[PDB]
Design a binder for this molecule. Structure first.
Ligand SMILES: NC(=O)c1ccc[n+]([C@@H]2O[C@H](COP(=O)([O-])OP(=O)(O)OC[C@H]3O[C@@H](n4cnc5c(N)ncnc54)[C@H](O)[C@@H]3O)[C@@H](O)[C@H]2O)c1
Ligand SMILES: NC(=O)c1ccc[n+]([C@@H]2O[C@H](COP(=O)([O-])OP(=O)(O)OC[C@H]3O[C@@H](n4cnc5c(N)ncnc54)[C@H](O)[C@@H]3O)[C@@H](O)[C@H]2O)c1
Ligand SMILES: NC(=O)c1ccc[n+]([C@@H]2O[C@H](COP(=O)([O-])OP(=O)(O)OC[C@H]3O[C@@H](n4cnc5c(N)ncnc54)[C@H](O)[C@@H]3O)[C@@H](O)[C@H]2O)c1
Ligand SMILES: NC(=O)c1ccc[n+]([C@@H]2O[C@H](COP(=O)([O-])OP(=O)(O)OC[C@H]3O[C@@H](n4cnc5c(N)ncnc54)[C@H](O)[C@@H]3O)[C@@H](O)[C@H]2O)c1
Ligand SMILES: Nc1ncnc2c1ncn2[C@@H]1O[C@H](CO)[C@@H](O)[C@H]1O
Ligand SMILES: Nc1ncnc2c1ncn2[C@@H]1O[C@H](CO)[C@@H](O)[C@H]1O
Ligand SMILES: Nc1ncnc2c1ncn2[C@@H]1O[C@H](CO)[C@@H](O)[C@H]1O
Ligand SMILES: Nc1ncnc2c1ncn2[C@@H]1O[C@H](CO)[C@@H](O)[C@H]1O
Ligand SMILES: [Cl-]
Ligand SMILES: [Cl-]
Ligand SMILES: [Cl-]
Ligand SMILES: [Cl-]
Ligand SMILES: [Rb+]
Ligand SMILES: [Rb+]
Ligand SMILES: [Rb+]
Ligand SMILES: [Rb+]
Ligand SMILES: [Rb+]
Ligand SMILES: [Rb+]
Lengths: 414, 414, 414, 414
C-alpha cells in the first residue's frame, strides 16, 4: 500500500517532476543505463529522503534499474504531496509521506519501511539505519549496504562505528566531492535564503544575519547573505573556520555576543542547542530564528515554548512567540530545515550530482556484495570524478587537458 | 461597491497587511499624524497601484487622513486577492481588482475609477492619468493634482508635458531620493530574483544572466545576480551607465551578442521590444526570459508566439515555447513584472519610503491647491530628507552631526 | 625658469609619461585636435595639480594647443620628480614642484604662478584661485576663467560665490558625470588601498576598516575594502548615504563608536577634524589612520602629536605615535592624500576622463570669452557625454542604440 | 662568510624586520619558547626561502633555538637586500642572496649551502633537496629531515618518493590547514594583485583577467580580482574546481578561447607551459602576462623571446615584447612570482602561520630523530590546530566551545 495526502495531485506532481529533470542530466544518463543493465534486479530498497521532485527523479532511476523500492519522508515538513501522489499513481512506488504528518505517523512509517525487509537503505540523517540496528538485529542478514546523504547522518554513523555496531557497509555520499562541495555550499546558500524570503518577504539588505557554523553549509549561507546585502556575523567552535570567516570579511564572535545584534539567526552546525534560552532573552524584539541543519534541535524550541506566554501563527511557516516581558521571537518552519520547510529545497542542478552519487553508491554496494568490509566507505574516486566530468559537460563548459610534456614534468623531480 | 475575487479572504488579508506593516514605521507615523490632522477631508482620490499588502498600508493611511478613496489594479497579475478583500470588508474602501482579470475587466475598472470624479489620482505607470486627459477633458476641473510611482510613468508624463496636455500638477514620486535609490535598486534587485526563483526553482549560481538596462533597477538586479553566483552581462544604450557596469565587473555588449550566451534574460529598460525575434532565434535551448520593467512590451512576446510551433504550461508562472527546430524558450509571468507576478513585489521595508513619498505628495498637493503651476513637480527636498531621517532612525542606525566649527570650515574659502 | 629636484631624471620621466599615456586615448585624441586648432594661442595658463604622469599628459595636451603654461604642485608629497624633470627638459614647460618641499617653498611657488599673470587657472583644491581673489584683485582683468578638479575645491568655490567674490567663470570639472562617477569612486577605491598597502604591506582581509564618508570616494573605498576581505564600517552625517551603506552590507555608526573597533581608518569627507583626540584615546593598540580627502585636516594630527609621548619613523610613509599608556597609533603619509603620498594616485584610465574634462573646459572658457556669467558653470552635457562615448569606444565595448520605433514609443503617452 | 649586495643596508633591514613582526605574534611566541628550550642546539640548518622580512623572522626564531643556519635565496628576484644585510650584520647568520643575481650565482649558492652539511633543510620548491639527493648521496647520513613550503615542492617530493629516492623524512608544511588555507589563498590573492599594480599602475576594474588554475592560489587571485572590479575568466584541467569557478560567478573556458579575451593573464597552476606561443599569437595588443606559481616555466617565455623581434624595459619590473606583426606582449617580473618580484610577497599576517608551521616542523624532526619513517609526513594535527588557536587569539577573535551535553550528543547515535 502507501500513505499519502491525495492521489489526485498526481498530474501536478508529474509536471513538477519533469520540470525538475531539466537540470538533472547526469542522473538521466544513469537512469538510461540502469534501464538497460538492471543492476537492482531482485533487490528491495528503502529510501528515507525528503520527498521532493529531485528525490522522485532518483526514485525513478532506481525503478528503471529494477529496484523494489519503498519511500518514506525524512522530515514531516519537507514532503511535496504532489510528488508523493505521482510516484504512487504513475510508477506504482509505495510512498509513506504526508506533508505535516505528526511524529506518531512518522515513526509508524519507519516501522512499515523496516517491514519491507530492505537489502539497501538510502538514508538522510540515519534515522532508519539507527532504528534497524537498535530494534531489528535479526534483519541484518538482509543488508547488502546502506548510504547516507547528509553530514549529520555521517556523524551518527561514526558514533555507531565507534560503538561497534556498524556491522555492514555504509556509503558516505555526503563527503563525495561532487556532493558537499556543491549541494552543502551553493545549494544551501541559495535555498536557505529562498525559504526565509518565502516565509517572511523580508528585505535582507541592511539586516544583521547571524550564521552559526562555518563549514560547507555555513560558507554558502554567509556568502549568499552577503551577496544579498546583509551584514553577516559568524559563530564557530573551531579556530580554522573562524579565521576563514574573518578573512572572508565577516564578523566572528561568540553566540552570546551575536544574540544582541542579529535580526535573523540561521543555524547550520549539526549540533544540539546552539541557540538557547539565555540567547532568546537578549535578542532584539522581533528577531527571526531558523535552522538549516538536518535536525531542528539546533534551536532550543522546547525551552522557548516553555518561556513564552503566547504563540500565534502570523503567516504561513511563521510563528510569533511572545515572552513574558512582551518581546517577540519569530520562528520559521518550526525550526525544521528552512529551505525545505518554507521553500522547495535545493535546486535540481546540485541534486543532480548528490543523487547521481546516491544511485552509483547503490550500484557499488550491489556490484561488490560480499567484498566490502563493514564500516564507512567513501565514494570511489573514479565515480566522484566521472560525475564531475559529466556535470561539467552538461553545463556546457569546456576546459583544458594536460599534454604529454606536462605529465612528464609532474613526474619529474631533478 | 467593489469588484473582488472573494470577500471571505478578508481575515487572511488582514493578517498579511499587519505583517507587512512591521517594516513600514515611517508610513505608520504619517498615518498617525493624518488621523489627527485630516488633510484629505472632503477629497476624493483614485489609486491605480499594485494591490499588495504595502499598497494596503498606504490606502489605510490616506483613509485615516479622511480621503474618499477608490483603488484599482495597475496590473492583472500583481493583485493579492486577500488584500483586496480586507480593504473592502474591514475599511469600506472600494477596490476594483481581481488577480488574473482580463483586459476588458481592467478597462472597465478604469472607467469606474474615473466616474469617482477624483480630485487626486495616485498612478503607477500613468495609465489612468492618460485616460483622464484623453477622454475626460470635462473632468479636469476636479483635479488638484496627480502623483506617479514609477519611471515609465514619469517618461509618459514628460511626453504629455511636451505635447501641451499636462495642464495640472503631477508629483514625481519615482525620482525622490528616498524612492528610486532604494525601491528601484535594492527592492527590485531582491524581488526580481525572488520571482524568478519562485517560478522556476532554478540555481542562479553558474548561470549567465543578461540584464537589459543599467539604471537604478538594472544596477540592483545585476548586483544581486552577481551576489547569487551568476555570470552577469549588461546591455545598454548610453555610455555612462555602460562604463559603470564594466567597472563593476560585468561584461557589456550588444543584445545581439548577449542573445547567444544568456541562460536567463531580465529586461529593466522601460523601453519597447528590447528582446526581439532575431534574438529568440539564436538563444540557447531552454533560455529563460522575463521582464521587470513596468510594461511587458519590453519582450516581443507577440513575435515569439508566431515563431513557436507549440506552447506548453510547464508549471505555475512558467510557459515553454517550442520552436520548429525543437529548442525551447521559457517565459515567466507572461512577460509581466516578474517580482510582482511570480512573487510578492518589493519587501515592505523599501515600500515604506516609496509610499511615505506618495502620502506626503498627496498632502503637498492639497495644501497647495490652486497654487501649483501645471507640469511636473519634484518631491520637496525637506520632505525627501525627512523620510530618510525617519527611516534611518527606524532602522536603529545612529550617525554623526557637524560641530559648529566644522560648519564654519565649510563656509570658509580663505 | 623652473624649480625642480633633478633635471637629470628627465629620461626616466619620459618613459613613465609614455607608459601612462597608453590608457589615456581620449586625452590623446584631444591633444591631436588641439595641435591642429590651437585654441590656446596667446593664452597664459597656470595649473596647480598633482605633478604626476597623468597631469603631464594633460600639460602636453594644453601645450599642443598653444598654451603658455606654468605648473606648480598641489601637494608636497604627490610630486613625481622625474615627471617634473621631463616637462621642463623635453617640453620647455616651467614647473615649480619638488617632492617633499616645505610650506614656504609651496607658498613661494604660488606667488611665482600668479606673477605669470594667467588668463586661465586649472586648480585642484582652489588654493591658487583663493589667493588670486584675496591678494591680486588688480589681476582679475586677466582672467578668462578657472577650473576646479576636486570636490573640496567646489565647496570652497561655492563659499566664494556666496561671499560675493566669485566674479569670473569657474568650471565645475569635479561634478561632470565622466569625472566623479569614475575618478572619485573607482579611482580612489583602488588607489587608496594601493597607498595603504605600499606604505604598510598589511593584510586587508580580516581587518575592520572604518570609512568616514559615503559619497563618491567613500563608496569606492568601501567597495574595494570589502572586495579585499575587510569588515567595513561607514560613518556619515547624512541619512540618504547612510541608508545606502547599510543596504550595501556595511555597518553604519557614529565615529565615537567606530573608534574602539577599527584597525584602519580612512577619511574621505572633505571636512575638518573627522578623527579627533577623543577617538585616538580609545583606539586599538596599533590602529592605522590615513586620509584620502584633499586636505590632511580631516585627521586632527595636531592633537595626536600632543597626546603622544613619542613619535618614531617605522618605515617609508609610516609614523608610529606612542601614547603614555604604551599603545600606538600609526599615521600614513602625514595625513596627506594616501593614494598620492604613498603610491602613484589614480590609474591613468580614469584620469583620462578627468583630464579630458579639464582640457575641454579650458577650451570652453576660451571660446566663450567675455560671454560667460560670473559664478560656477557645470560641464556642458554634450561635452560630458562625448567624453563617455569616446572612452567606452576606447575600452573596446559596443552597446545598443534605439530604433526609430523605440524612439517613437518614448514620446508616446497615449 | 656570506654573499650579499650591501652590508650598509642593515639598519633599514632591521627596521623592516621589526615592522613585519608586528603581525607575527605566533612565531614570536615560538621564538621565546625556543630561546628557553634550545631545541636546535648543535643542529646545522639550511633554509632556501624567499629572503624577506618574514623569512628573517623565521631565521631569528631558529637562531634563538640554537640552530647553526645558512640562508640562500629561493628566487633571484624575491630577495630583499636590506633583510640580507641585517641577518648578516646583526645576527651573524650567513646569507647568500643578492636581488637580481644570475643563474650561475644561484647555483653556486646551492653548492655552498650543501657544503654547510645541514642536518635540517627548509626548502621552498625543493631545489636544494633535489640537488642533495642527485649530487650528494654521501651526505644523506647528515639528514634528520627536511621541510617543504610550497605546493610545487610537494609535487616534486612525491615524484622523488615514487622514484624510490626519498630516503629521509620530509615535512609537508604547504598542506597544513594553517598554511595553504590562508597563505596560498588570501595571501596570494592580495599580494599577486599588489605586484601587478606596483609594476603597472593599471586600473583593474573593467579589465578581463584570466586566472589559470583554480586551486588554493587561483581561488584567492580570482576572488580578489573580482573584488577589484575585474571580469574574471578561469582555466582548468580538472572538472571539480572548474564547476566551483562557475558557481562562484566566473567564466570557465579553455586557454585557447581565453587567450583572445584577456587583458591580464595570471598563471597559478604549478605546471609547465600553460601559456604558449599559439596563445601569444592571438592575444590583444598590449596584453599583460605574469606568473604567481613557484617557477616561471608556467609561461613559455623562451618561445616568446624567440618569436619577438624586439624587447624593451618599459618600466620597473615590466618588459614589452614586440612581435613581428607589430603587436606587443607585456611581461611582468620576467615571469617570476609576481607578488615577490614586483612587490614584497604575502603580508606577514599569513606568513606568521606558514612559518610557525616551519619552525614547529623543524622541532618535530629533531624531537623525533630516529623515530620517523622515510617519506612525506603531514604536520601533526595537534600542531596545526594549536597554530590556529594561537592565531585566532592574537587576532582578537573569540568563539564558542562545546558543552558536555553537546559532546554527548555527537557521540550518540540512537
Ligand atoms: N538544509 C539542507 O539542505 C542541508 C544540506 C546539507 C547539509 N545539511 C546539514 O547542515 C549541517 C551542517 O553541515 P555541513 O556540511 O556544513 O557540516 P560541516 O562539518 O562542514 O560544518 C559544521 C561546522 O559547524 C561548526 N560548529 C559545530 N558546532 C557548533 C556550534 N555549537 N556553534 C558554532 N559552530 C559550530 C563546526 O566547527 C563546523 O565548522 C548538518 O546538520 C548537515 O546535515 C543541511
Ligand atoms: N518591477 C518593479 O518593481 C519596478 C520598480 C521600479 C521601477 N520599475 C521599472 O523598471 C524600469 C527601469 O526603471 P529605472 O528606474 O531603472 O530607469 P532608469 O531611467 O534609471 O534606467 C533605465 C536604463 O535602461 C537603459 N536602456 C533604455 N533602453 C534600453 C535598451 N533598449 N537596451 C538597453 N538599455 C536600455 C537606459 O539607458 C537607462 O540606463 C522602468 O520601466 C520602471 O518603471 C519596475
Ligand atoms: N584622493 C583622491 O585622489 C581624491 C579624489 C577625488 C576626491 N577627493 C576628495 O575626497 C573628498 C570626498 O569627495 P567626494 O567626491 O566623495 O564627496 P561627496 O560630497 O560626494 O561625499 C562626501 C561625503 O562625506 C560625508 N561627510 C561629510 N562630513 C562628514 C563627517 N564629519 N563624518 C562623516 N561623513 C561626513 C557627506 O555627507 C558626503 O556623503 C573631498 O575632499 C574630495 O576633494 C580625493
Ligand atoms: N606566489 C606565491 O606566493 C605562492 C604561494 C603559494 C603557492 N604558490 C604556488 O602556486 C602554484 C599553485 O598552488 P596551489 O596551492 O594553488 O595548488 P593547487 O594544487 O591547490 O591548485 C593548482 C590547480 O591548477 C590546476 N591546473 C593544473 N595544471 C593546469 C593547467 N595546465 N591549466 C589550468 N589549470 C591547471 C589544477 O587542476 C589545480 O586545481 C604552485 O606553483 C605553488 O607552489 C605560490
Ligand atoms: N531538493 C531537495 N530534494 C532532496 N533532498 C534535498 C533537497 N534539498 C536538500 N536536500 C538534502 O537534504 C539533506 C539534509 O537533510 C542535505 O544533505 C541535502 O542533500
Ligand atoms: N510590494 C509592492 N507593493 C506595491 N507596489 C510595488 C511593490 N513592489 C514594487 N512596487 C512598485 O511598482 C512600480 C512598478 O510598476 C515600482 O515603481 C514600485 O514602486
Ligand atoms: N594620478 C593622478 N594624477 C593627477 N591627479 C590625480 C591623480 N589621482 C588623483 N588625482 C586628482 O586629485 C584630486 C584630489 O586633490 C582628485 O579630484 C583627482 O581628480
Ligand atoms: N612574504 C613572503 N616571505 C616569504 N615567503 C613568502 C612570502 N610570500 C610568499 N611566500 C611563500 O613563497 C612560496 C612560493 O615559492 C609560497 O608557498 C609562500 O608560502
Ligand atoms: Cl555512469
Ligand atoms: Cl511626518
Ligand atoms: Cl574631441
Ligand atoms: Cl608552541
Ligand atoms: Rb519542486
Ligand atoms: Rb619538475
Ligand atoms: Rb505580501
Ligand atoms: Rb606614474
Ligand atoms: Rb617587507
Ligand atoms: Rb545524536
Amino acid at each position: 500500500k502507501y500513505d499519502i495526502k491525495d492521489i489526485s495531485l498526481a498530474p501536478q506532481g508529474r509536471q513538477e517532476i519533469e520540470w525538475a529533470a531539466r537540470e538533472m542530466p547526469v542522473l538521466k544518463q544513469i537512469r538510461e543505463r540502469f534501464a538497460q543493465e538492471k543492476p537492482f534486479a531482485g533487490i528491495r530498497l528503502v529510501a528515507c529522503c525528503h520527498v521532493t521532485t529531485e528525490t522522485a527523479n532518483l526514485a525513478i532511476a532506481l525503478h528503471a534499474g529494477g529496484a523494489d523500492s519503498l519511500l518514506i519522508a525524512s522530515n514531516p515538513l519537507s514532503t511535496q504531496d504532489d510528488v508523493a501522489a505521482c510516484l504512487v499513481a504513475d510508477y506504482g512506488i509505495p510512498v509513506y509521506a504526508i506533508k505535516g504528518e505528526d511524529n506518531e505517523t512518522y515513526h509508524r512509517h519507519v516501522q512499515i519501511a523496516l517491514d519491507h525487509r530492505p537489502n539497501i537503505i538510502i538514508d538522510d540523517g540515519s534515522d532508519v539505519v539507527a532504528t534497524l540496528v537498535q530494534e531489528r538485529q535479526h534483519q541484518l542478514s538482509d543488508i547488502i549496504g546502506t548510504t547516507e546523504e547528509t553530514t549529520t547522518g555521517i556523524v551518527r554513523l561514526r558514533a555507531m562505528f565507534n560503538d561497534g555496531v556498524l556491522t555492514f557497509p555504509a556509503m558516505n555520499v555526503n563527503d563525495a566531492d561532487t556532493k558537499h562541495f556543491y549541494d552543502n555550499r551553493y545549494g544551501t546558500g541559495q535555498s536557505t535564503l529562498d525559504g526565509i524570503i518565502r516565509a517572511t518577504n523580508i528585505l535582507l539588505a541592511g539586516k544583521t544575519i547571524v550564521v552559526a557554523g562555518y563549514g560547507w553549509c555555513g560558507k554558502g549561507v554567509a556568502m549568499r547573505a552577503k551577496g544579498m546585502g546583509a551584514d553577516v556575523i559568524v559563530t564557530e567552535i573551531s579556530p580554522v573556520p573562524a579565521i576563514e570567516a574573518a578573512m572572508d570579511g565577516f564578523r566572528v564572535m561568540p553566540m552570546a555576543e551575536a544574540a544582541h545584534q542579529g535580526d535573523i539567526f540561521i543555524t547550520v552546525t549539526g549540533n544540539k542547542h546552539v541557540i538557547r534560552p539565555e540567547h532568546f532573552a537578549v535578542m532584539k524584539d522581533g528577531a527571526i530564528v531558523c535552522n538549516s541543519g538536518h535536525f531542528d534541535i539546533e534551536i532550543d524550541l522546547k525551552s522557548l515554548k516553555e518561556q513564552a506566554k503566547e504563540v500565534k501563527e502570523v503567516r504561513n511557516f511563521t510563528e510569533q512567540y511572545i515572552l513574558p516581558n512582551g518581546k517577540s521571537i519569530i520562528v520559521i518552519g518550526e525550526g525544521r530545515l528552512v529551505n525545505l520547510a518554507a521553500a522547495t529545497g535545493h535546486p535540481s542542478a546540485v541534486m543532480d550530482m548528490s543523487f547521481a552519487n546516491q544511485a552509483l553508491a547503490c550500484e557499488h554496494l550491489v556490484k561488490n556484495k560480499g567484498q566490502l568490509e563493514p564500516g564507512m566507505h567513501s565514494i570511489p574516486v573514479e565515480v566522484d570524478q566521472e560525475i564531475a566530468r559529466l556535470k561539467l559537460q552538461a553545463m556546457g563548459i569546456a576546459i583544458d587537458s594536460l599534454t604529454p610534456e606536462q605529465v612528464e614534468y609532474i613526474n619529474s623531480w631533478a
